[PDB]
Ligand binder design. Structure first.
Ligand SMILES: O=C(O)Cc1ccc(O)c([N+](=O)[O-])c1
Length: 227
C-alpha cells in the first residue's frame, strides 16, 4: 500500500504564509489522486478545508488554498491566524482506496451538520451500529465515508456508501468487518461493525463525499470502546 508523507511538524508566526506538503510513495501526486486537506482541532474536531487538489470547501476562510507543487500536493495558509494552530491531514485516492498522510502539527507562534454520538462501550464478540445523523443538505445526493482512528494511530478509511442505491466500497482492512447502510427518511447513515475485538476500539468518523468532492464535512466522531 502507498505511504502518504507529510511534514511531522511546522512552525509559522501570525500573519505569515506557510506551506504544508503531501507526498506519495508511488510517484507524483496528480489531480487523479483527488487530494483533500482536513484540519483536526482538539477533541477530535475535523474540518474539511480543500477537496480535489485546489477547491476550497464553502465557508472555509479564503487564506487556505490547495495546489500541486512539482511532485506533491501542497496546502498554503496565507496570513496564518492564531486559531490555525492544528493538525492538518491530506488524503489521496489510489484507484480504489483512500490513504491518509500522517498529519502535520502546525504551531502558530505565540449549515451542513453530521451528528454522531460521543461514545459507546460494547463487549467483544458483539456487534454495534454507529449512527451519523445529517442535516443542512439533500442527503440522497451525497455519499457518506467512514474513517477511524485507533488511539495513538493514524487515520484509516473504512469505506463509503452511496445512498442512491446503497452501493458500497470498503478498504481492504474493513472489507469483512464493516457494513454500511442508510435510512433516507431520517437522513441518517449507519456503520455496523461485527465480531468486535479490543482492536476495534477507536474514534469512528462519518464524512460526506461524492464523485469529485470528498471529506468536506465531518461528524464529530464516536469513541467506541470494546472492553
Ligand atoms: O471522486 C472520484 O472520482 C474518486 C472516486 C471514485 C470512485 C469511488 O468509489 C470513490 N470512493 O471514494 O469510493 C472515489
Amino acid at each position: 500500500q502507498a505511504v502518504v508523507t507529510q511534514e511531522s511538524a511546522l512552525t509559522t508566526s501570525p500573519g505569515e504564509t506557510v506551506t504544508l506538503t503531501c507526498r506519495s510513495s508511488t510517484g507524483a501526486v496528480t489531480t487523479s489522486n483527488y487530494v483533500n486537506w482536513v484540519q483536526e482541532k482538539p477533541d477530535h474536531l475535523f474540518t474539511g478545508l480543500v477537496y480535489s487538489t485546489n477547491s476550497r470547501v464553502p465557508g472555509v476562510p479564503a487564506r487556505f488554498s490547495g495546489s500541486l507543487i512539482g511532485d506533491k500536493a501542497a496546502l498554503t495558509i496565507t496570513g496564518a491566524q492564531a486559531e490555525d494552530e492544528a493538525i492538518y491531514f491530506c488524503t489521496l485516492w489510489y484507484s480504489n482506496h483512500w490513504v491518509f498522510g500522517g498529519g502535520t502539527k502546525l504551531t502558530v507562534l505565540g449549515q451542513v451538520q453530521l451528528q454522531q454520538p460521543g461514545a459507546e462501550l460494547v463487549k467483544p464478540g458483539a456487534s454495534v451500529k454507529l449512527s451519523c445523523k445529517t442535516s443542512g443538505y439533500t442527503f440522497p445526493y451525497y455519499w457518506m465515508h467512514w474513517v477511524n482512528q485507533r488511539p495513538g494511530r493514524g487515520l484509516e478509511w473504512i469505506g463509503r456508501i452511496d445512498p442512491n442505491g446503497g452501493g458500497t466500497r470498503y478498504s481492504e482492512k474493513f472489507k469483512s468487518k464493516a457494513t454500511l447502510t442508510v435510512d433516507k427518511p431520517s437522513n441518517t447513515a449507519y456503520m455496523q461493525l461485527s465480531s468486535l475485538t479490543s482492536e476495534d476500539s477507536a474514534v469512528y468518523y462519518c464524512a460526506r463525499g461524492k464523485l469529485g468532492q470528498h471529506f468536506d464535512y465531518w461528524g464529530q466522531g464516536t469513541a467506541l470502546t470494546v472492553s
